[PDB]
Amino acid sequence: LPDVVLKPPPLFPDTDYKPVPLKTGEGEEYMLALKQELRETMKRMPYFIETPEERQDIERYSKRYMKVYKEEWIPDWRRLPREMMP
Amino acid sequence: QGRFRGNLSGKRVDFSGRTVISPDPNLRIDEVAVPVHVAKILTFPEKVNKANINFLRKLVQNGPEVHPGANFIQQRHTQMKRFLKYGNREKMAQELKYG
Amino acid sequence: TEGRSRDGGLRLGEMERDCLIGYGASMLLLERLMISSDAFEVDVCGQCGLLGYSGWCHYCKSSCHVSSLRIPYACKLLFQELQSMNIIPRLKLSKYN
Amino acid sequence: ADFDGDEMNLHLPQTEEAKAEALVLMGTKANLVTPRNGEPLIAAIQDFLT
Amino acid sequence: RITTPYMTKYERARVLGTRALQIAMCAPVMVELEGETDPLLIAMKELKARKIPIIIRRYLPDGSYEDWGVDELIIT
Amino acid sequence: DLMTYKGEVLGITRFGLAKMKESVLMLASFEKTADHLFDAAYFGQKDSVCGVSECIIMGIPMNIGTGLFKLLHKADRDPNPPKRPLIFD
Amino acid sequence: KEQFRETDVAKKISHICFGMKSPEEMRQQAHIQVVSKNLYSQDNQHAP
Amino acid sequence: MEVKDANSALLSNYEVFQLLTDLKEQRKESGKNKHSSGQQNLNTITYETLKYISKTPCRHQSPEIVREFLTALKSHKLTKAEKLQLLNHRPVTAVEIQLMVEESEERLTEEQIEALLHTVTS
Amino acid sequence: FVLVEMVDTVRIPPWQFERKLNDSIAEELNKKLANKVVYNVGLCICLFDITKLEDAYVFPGDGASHTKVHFRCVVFHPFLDEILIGKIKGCSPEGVHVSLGFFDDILIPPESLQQPAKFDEAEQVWVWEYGEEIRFRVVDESFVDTSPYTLVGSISEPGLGLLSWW
Amino acid sequence: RCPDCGSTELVEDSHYSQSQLVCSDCGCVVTEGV
RNA sequence: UGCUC
Ligand SMILES: Nc1nc2c(ncn2[C@@H]2O[C@H](COP(=O)(O)OP(=O)(O)OP(=O)(O)O)[C@@H](O)[C@H]2O)c(=O)[nH]1
Ligand SMILES: Nc1ncnc2c1ncn2[C@@H]1O[C@H](COP(=O)(O)OP(=O)(O)OP(=O)(O)O)C[C@H]1O
Ligand SMILES: [Mg+2]
Ligand SMILES: [Zn+2]
Numbered sequence: 001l002p003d004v005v006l007k008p009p010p011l012f013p014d015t016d017y018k019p020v021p022l023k024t025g026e027g028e029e030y031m032l033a034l035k036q037e038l039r040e041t042m043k044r045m046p047y048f049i050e051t052p053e054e055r056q057d058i059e060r061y062s063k064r065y066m067k068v069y070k071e072e073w074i075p076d077w078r079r080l081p082r083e084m085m086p
Numbered sequence: 087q088g089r090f091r092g093n094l095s096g097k098r099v100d101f102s103g104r105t106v107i108s109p110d111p112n113l114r115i116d117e118v119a120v121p122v123h124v125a126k127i128l129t130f131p132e133k134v135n136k137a138n139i140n141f142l143r144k145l146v147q148n149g150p151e152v153h154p155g156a157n158f159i160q161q162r163h164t165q166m167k168r169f170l171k172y173g174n175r176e177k178m179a180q181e182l183k184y185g
Numbered sequence: 186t187e188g189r190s191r192d193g194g195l196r197l198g199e200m201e202r203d204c205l206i207g208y209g210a211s212m213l214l215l216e217r218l219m220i221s222s223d224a225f226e227v228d229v230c231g232q233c234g235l236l237g238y239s240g241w242c243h244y245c246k247s248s249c250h251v252s253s254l255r256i257p258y259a260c261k262l263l264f265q266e267l268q269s270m271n272i273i274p275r276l277k278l279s280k281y282n
Numbered sequence: 283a284d285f286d287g288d289e290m291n292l293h294l295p296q297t298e299e300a301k302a303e304a305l306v307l308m309g310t311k312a313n314l315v316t317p318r319n320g321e322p323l324i325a326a327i328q329d330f331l332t
Numbered sequence: 333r334i335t336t337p338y339m340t341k342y343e344r345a346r347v348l349g350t351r352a353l354q355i356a357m358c359a360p361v362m363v364e365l366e367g368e369t370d371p372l373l374i375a376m377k378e379l380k381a382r383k384i385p386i387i388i389r390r391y392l393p394d395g396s397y398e399d400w401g402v403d404e405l406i407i408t
Numbered sequence: 409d410l411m412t413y414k415g416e417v418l419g420i421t422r423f424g425l426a427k428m429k430e431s432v433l434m435l436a437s438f439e440k441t442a443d444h445l446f447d448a449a450y451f452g453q454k455d456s457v458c459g460v461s462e463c464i465i466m467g468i469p470m471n472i473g474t475g476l477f478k479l480l481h482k483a484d485r486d487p488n489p490p491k492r493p494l495i496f497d
Numbered sequence: 498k499e500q501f502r503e504t505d506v507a508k509k510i511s512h513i514c515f516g517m518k519s520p521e522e523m524r525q526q527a528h529i530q531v532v533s534k535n536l537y538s539q540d541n542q543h544a545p
Numbered sequence: 546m547e548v549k550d551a552n553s554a555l556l557s558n559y560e561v562f563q564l565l566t567d568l569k570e571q572r573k574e575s576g577k578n579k580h581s582s583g584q585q586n587l588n589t590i591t592y593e594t595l596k597y598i599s600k601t602p603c604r605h606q607s608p609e610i611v612r613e614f615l616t617a618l619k620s621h622k623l624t625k626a627e628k629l630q631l632l633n634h635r636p637v638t639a640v641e642i643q644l645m646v647e648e649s650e651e652r653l654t655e656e657q658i659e660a661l662l663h664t665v666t667s
Numbered sequence: 668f669v670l671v672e673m674v675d676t677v678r679i680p681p682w683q684f685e686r687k688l689n690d691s692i693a694e695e696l697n698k699k700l701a702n703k704v705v706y707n708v709g710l711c712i713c714l715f716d717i718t719k720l721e722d723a724y725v726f727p728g729d730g731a732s733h734t735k736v737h738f739r740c741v742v743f744h745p746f747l748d749e750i751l752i753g754k755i756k757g758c759s760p761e762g763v764h765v766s767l768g769f770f771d772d773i774l775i776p777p778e779s780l781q782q783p784a785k786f787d788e789a790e791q792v793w794v795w796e797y798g799e800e801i802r803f804r805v806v807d808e809s810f811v812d813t814s815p816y817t818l819v820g821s822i823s824e825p826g827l828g829l830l831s832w833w
Numbered sequence: 834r835c836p837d838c839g840s841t842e843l844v845e846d847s848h849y850s851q852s853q854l855v856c857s858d859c860g861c862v863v864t865e866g867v
Numbered sequence: 868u869g870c871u872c
Contacts, residue, residue, distance in 0.1 A: 008530040057552060057746050058626055061648050089266070090437035093259035094465045095199050098187065099222040102195040102293040109285055115324060116310035120292065127849045128294045133356040138369035150848075157848070158862065166836060169848070172860035184358050192850035195291045206460060207317075208307045209342055209473030212349060212727055213300040219467035221296050234514065235526065241815040244526050248812050252508045257467045268518075272449040275514040281507040281726060282676060282735060288872050298356050299349030299727065302372050303474060306345035346474040346727075353730040359681040385482035385684070386725070399480065432515065445515075454514040466510055469727050481723045481732045485688035492564070492716045495608045496557045496615070496629070498710070498771060500810070500817040501703035503546045507676070507726070507733070549672035551708045551744065561668050561712070561741055568697075568713060580694060587701035587713070593769035594712055600768055601752070630750055644828055645800065647748055 046073045101128050122153050129157050134182050146170060146179040223258035234275030236264065252278060335390055335398065339405035343388055344379070347402060351375035351384050379407065434461040555625065557632045558598055559606045565595040602635045617664045621657065624648070631665060670715055670739045671708055675699070679732045689717060692736050700740060704817045706808050709744030710771060743770070745803035745820070753801050760787045765799055765822065774801060776822035796833045800824070837861040 022028070042048060077085060103124045110119060134142055148155035150171050159168045159178060162185035168178065186193035197205075197217055205214045229235070230242035231250035241248045254276075264274050283290070295301045306312070314324045352371040355361065361374060362383040368374050378384045382403040391397050410428075411417055418424035422439040429435060432448040432455040448455070457463055463470040518526065537543040568591055581588065611632065618628045627646060636642055639658055643649060677695050679688075693714055700711045719737035726733060745751070756772055757764035766772035778785045784795045802823040809817050834841050835856035842857035853865040 004535055005532050008532045055552075058624070060624060060626070061652070088441065089259060089263050090441060090465075091199065093223075094257070094263065095437060095461075096197055096202060097218060097222050097257075097259060098194045098196045099217055099293070100194045101221060101296060102291060104189075104195055104289050104291050107283060107285060107288060107290050118292075124292070128292075130294060131296060133358075135356055135358050135371070137355070137361070137365060137371075137374065141369045167862035167865065168837075169853070169855045169860040169862055171846075171848070172855060172857050178860075195293070197293075202464065206470070206472070210300070210303040210307050210345070211469045211473040211475040212297065212346070213295060213303045213308075214464065215467065215469050215727075216295060216297045216300040217293070218464060224467075229508075231508075239815040240812075243528060244522075248815075249810070252506055254508055254510065255467060257465070260465055260467060263465075267445065270445070271517055272445050273516050273518050275516055277511050277514060278508040279511045280676065281509040282724070282733070284872090286872075297349075298352040298371055299346070299730075302349035302352050302375065303345040305372065306341060306348060312341070342474045343477070346477075346479065350479060350725060350727075350730060354681040354684075357681040357730060360685050387480040387482050389478040389480050389722070389724075391477055401482070433513075448515045449517055452514070452516050454512050456512040457510060468509070475727070479725050481684070481725050483684060483688045483723055483732065485720065485723070487720055489689055489717055489720065491718060494554060494556060495560055495611045496632070497554045498773070498816070498818075499703050500808075501546075501700065501705045501711070502812065507678075507728075546673070546675060548705065548708055549674070551669070551671050551742070552746075553670045553672055553739065555669050555746075556741070558668065564713065564715060564741065575690075580698070584698040584701060587697050590702045590712060597768035597770050626746060626748065634750065634752075638830075640828060640830060645750060 046071065103128060126150070126153060126157075131160075134184050136184065139182065139184075143179040143182055146175055146182065149175050219255075219257050225256055225258045225261060226253050227256050227261055228252070229254050229276050229278055231278050234277055235268075235273075236261070254278065333398070335400075337406050339388075339402070339407050343405075344407070347384060347386050347388070348372065348375045348379060350386065351378060382407075429459075431455050431459040431462055433465055434459055437461060437465070555629055557611065557629060558601065558603045559608075559611060559632075562595070562598045562603050562606075565591055565598065569595060601633075603633075614664060618661075621661070623652070631661070635665060636662075637666065668712075668741055669709075669744055671705075671711070671742050672718075672737065672739055674735060674737050677734050677736055678729070679734070681731060684732070688723065688734070689720065692720065692734060693717060696736070696738060696740070704808070705742070706810070706817070709742040709806070710818060711740050711742045713741060715739045715741050744806065747803060747805060749803050751801040751803065753799055755791075755793060755799055758787055758791045758793065760789055763787065763793065765801060767801075771818070773819050774822050775819055776801065776824055781824055782826060794833075798832065800827060800829070835859065835861050835863065 075084070105121070105124065113119060132138065132142060142156070145155045146159065150157045150169075155170070157170055159170065159182075160166075161168070162183055170178070187196075202214065202218070205217070228237035228240055228242075228251050230237050230245060230247075231252060232247070233242065233244050235242065235244050237243070237248075237251045240251050240253075242251050267274055295304055310324070315322050351359075352375040355371040355374050361378075362385070363374070363377050363381050365374050365377065368377065375384070379402070384402045386402055388400045388402070388405070389397055390400060411419070411424075414428065418427050422435075425438060426435050426444075432444065432453060436444045436448075455462065457466060457468060458471060460470045460472055469475040537545055572588070572591075614632060615628065618631070627648065630646060631642070634641065636646075639662060642658055642661055643653060675696060677692050677699075679691050679695065683691050696714050696717075701713065702710070704710045715738070717736055717738040721735055723732045723734040725731070751767060751774075753765045753767045753774060755763060756766035762775055762777050764772070765774045765776055767774065778787065781794060782797070786792075802825065804821040804823050806820055807818070811817065835843065835858065838856065838859045838861065840856060840858040843854055843863055844857045845852065845854045847853065851865065852867045854863045855861065855865075856863060
């Protein structure tokens with residue numbers, strides 16, 4: 001008959017097989033660097049819309065100095081339907 | 087005997103009794119006779135107010151033995167019940183606060 | 186309990202509930218079947234809709250959305266049994282107003 | 283009932299609102315007639331008709 | 333103004349119960365009771381005197397509502 | 409009329425009762441408890457507390473009877489009281 | 498000094514939303530894992 | 546117990562002083578034993594805030610003076626926070642406006658300070 | 668100091684019906700929001716006024732009078748740049764312990780921006796010479812119940828000169 | 834001990850089919866229901 | 868199971 005267990009099995013049981021190490025070479029490193037560059041450059045892209053901040057505490061003279069300025073891309077309204085114009 | 091039919095739709099309650107019936111034409115149609123024995127067991131919680139303060143004082147002074155009376159007192163501040171069979175019932179009657 | 190030898194109380198069967206409904210006495214029916222029989226105060230979490238304990242929801246590991254609620258004990262037993270059957274009743278509470 | 287050994291139940295409400303609702307809606311004087319056809323059920327019986 | 337001007341038995345019962353509970357909870361009396369130790373009797377006296385400060389809020393099935401005073405309604 | 413308000417004569421049996429009513433708790437309490445409960449769990453049908461049986465089960469005053477309406481207190485008050493004026497604004 | 502937190506609210510249940518729980522939600526809801534098939538101990542106290 | 550807007554409208558210390566005085570007089574005119582025993586933190590906070598506002602120069606203020614000061618500062622294109630601070634502090638010295646008051650660069654002009662002092666002192 | 672709009676369901680028992688509804692509502696709201704800090708709002712002082720007060724219901728339960736009241740209340744919540752005047756109610760090695768006058772002992776100015784002669788040797792020494800001013804910097808709140816304070820804020824003391832007191 | 838008077842005269846006296854441990858000096862109901 | 872109604 002099967003024996004009784006006093007404590008539950010470990011949350012992460014150990015395994016004798018480990019993951020195969022990653023492939024090495026200039027190609028993999030270049031792809032990694034390019035993916036990191038894409039991560040870094042695609043957040044500042046106008047397509048990356050951020051959450052509109054709201055509930056400003058007060059208005060100040062330094063506003064014009066701290067006013068975030070960023071160019072906005074103009075969608076082609078010819079291809080896009082009319083329901084998306086502001 | 088399921089939960090819906092046995093414990094939700096119809097369930098047992100307290101403050102109730104079951105007794106045999108007998109005829110008595112001397113009572114009104116809207117009146118029913120209750121025995122003293124059952125009357126001393128089924129209790130009703132009355133709130134001490136400015137109107138029935140003296141009646142409840144007298145009921146507490148009577149005690150659980152005499153038919154007109156009470157069995158337990160629950161204070162307004164603390165919810166610790168007090169049994170009237172023990173202790174000085176007069177001191178409890180004199181200290182009946184509103185509520 | 187059921188029997189007199191067991192110090193049991195009377196039973197308001199389904200027909201008694203039907204009569205009370207026909208009379209329309211809602212408060213009397215509530216006091217009989219809820220207040221004086223199996224009244225209890227449970228703690229329900231307004232986020233997941235599950236039952237908590239001592240003002241704490243072990244599911245979400247929080248206590249800000251936990252609120253007290255009056256309920257018949259048989260109804261809580263039914264909810265627990267249904268949760269045991271994988272039928273999870275999610276309670277969405279709201280103000281009485 | 284026929285007073286031949288029948289056991290009847292007697293319940294005591296534990297709330298003023300329930301008490302008032304029982305006295306008003308379930309009052310004996312307010313239910314002298316049945317809702318089936320309006321005929322009066324609470325009337326004279328044997329030893330009263332004779 | 334479109335509902336029945338008569339005060340139903342259910343409204344009577346609920347108003348009497350609420351007033352009895354309030355009086356049992358140390359509420360002021362507006363009829364100068366004369367040795368009435370039962371709150372329900374005081375509530376019935378206030379109803380017969382038409383001095384219960386309660387306004388019924390009758391709700392229509394669609395959602396509309398209307399207020400009716402106890403002294404404004406008709407009792408039987 | 410209750411048997412002929414959906415355009416079809418529906419009987420009082422469990423089938424017609426299910427076709428007419430919508431509350432899950434009432435159908436589960438009447439007949440076919442496990443079947444109806446599992447069907448509702450699968451459909452995820454949210455059941456309201458508008459019916460009478462569910463009000464009795466959950467321990468809340470039923471909508472029928474004295475609970476159809478609400479009561480208001482005739483307290484001495486003044487709706488929309490005067491507001492303190494703002495000096496700085 | 499002291500934070501404002503509501504003591505009790507007159508919450509009224511609106512409706513019951515039936516559904517199902519995934520094994521992960523079952524693990525999250527549960528507190529302990531039952532793995533012993535026996536009920537009581539070997540000692541004479543027979544503690545669980 | 547939710548809030549709709551935590552920054553609905555800013556108010557100076559004079560409004561708070563008037564509200565505290567009104568609450569204090571209504572309390573001493575309608576003092577209740579059980580209501581006071583239930584929560585005594587109200588009395589403490591009210592009295593201590595009133596004493597704090599009394600320690601400040603907030604006294605000798607009236608709605609007409611506040612309106613006149615606001616109308617006088619409206620011509621100085623100053624922000625609401627600056628005038629709020631000037632009214633709550635009532636600076637008698639110039640250094641208080643030169644350095645302590647924020648947004649000093651390009652706003653003092655070395656000539657408007659005299660007008661600000663004459664207005665706040667009047 | 669700033670006004671805050673709130674909506675509260677106030678429950679008045681039946682033994683307060685002889686009193687005016689508005690006065691009782693104001694008293695209850697003051698008793699419920701006295702010396703308490705509402706999260707992300709600040710420490711409420713007292714009730715300013717009551718704007719909207721709709722019908723008063725009576726539930727079939729407790730039987731009391733429940734009223735949904737919209738009101739405006741005053742709360743102490745700087746705007747991250749307000750200037751205050753407090754008194755030094757102690758001092759610690761890592762930072763002085765200044766408190767607004769009998770208002771709240773929660774202002775903990777960090778000593779990391781004054782001229783480079785800043786240190787506290789536990790003898791209540793404020794600062795080596797070359798009514799205490801305070802410049803609020805940031806607000807911060809935290810919860811309390813986490814098992815079956817809340818307002819400190821940072822204070823700034825720049826080179827204000829202070830010709831009156833060093 | 835009794836929570837009100839602090840006495841130790843706690844007796845288990847069933848009052849009409851109601852098991853109740855109550856103080857025997859002042860009558861403060863210590864525990865009730867089983 | 869026996870009953871009581
Ligand atoms: N003396 C006695 N006999 C009983 C009782 N209940 C059932 N029986 C007998 O057992 C037979 C029916 O058994 P059930 O009543 O179905 O037993 P059960 O309800 O499955 O048993 P439990 O689930 O343990 O209550 C009948 O022929 C009865 O004679 C009882 O309470 N007392
Ligand atoms: N199985 C049962 N279900 C419901 N009620 C019952 C049952 N058995 C008895 N009763 C109660 O007893 C009453 C039956 O009496 P009834 O049949 O009218 O007279 P009887 O027993 O024929 O007497 P006679 O033989 O005519 O002298 C009515 C009912 O309330
Ligand atoms: Mg018979
Ligand atoms: Zn949760």
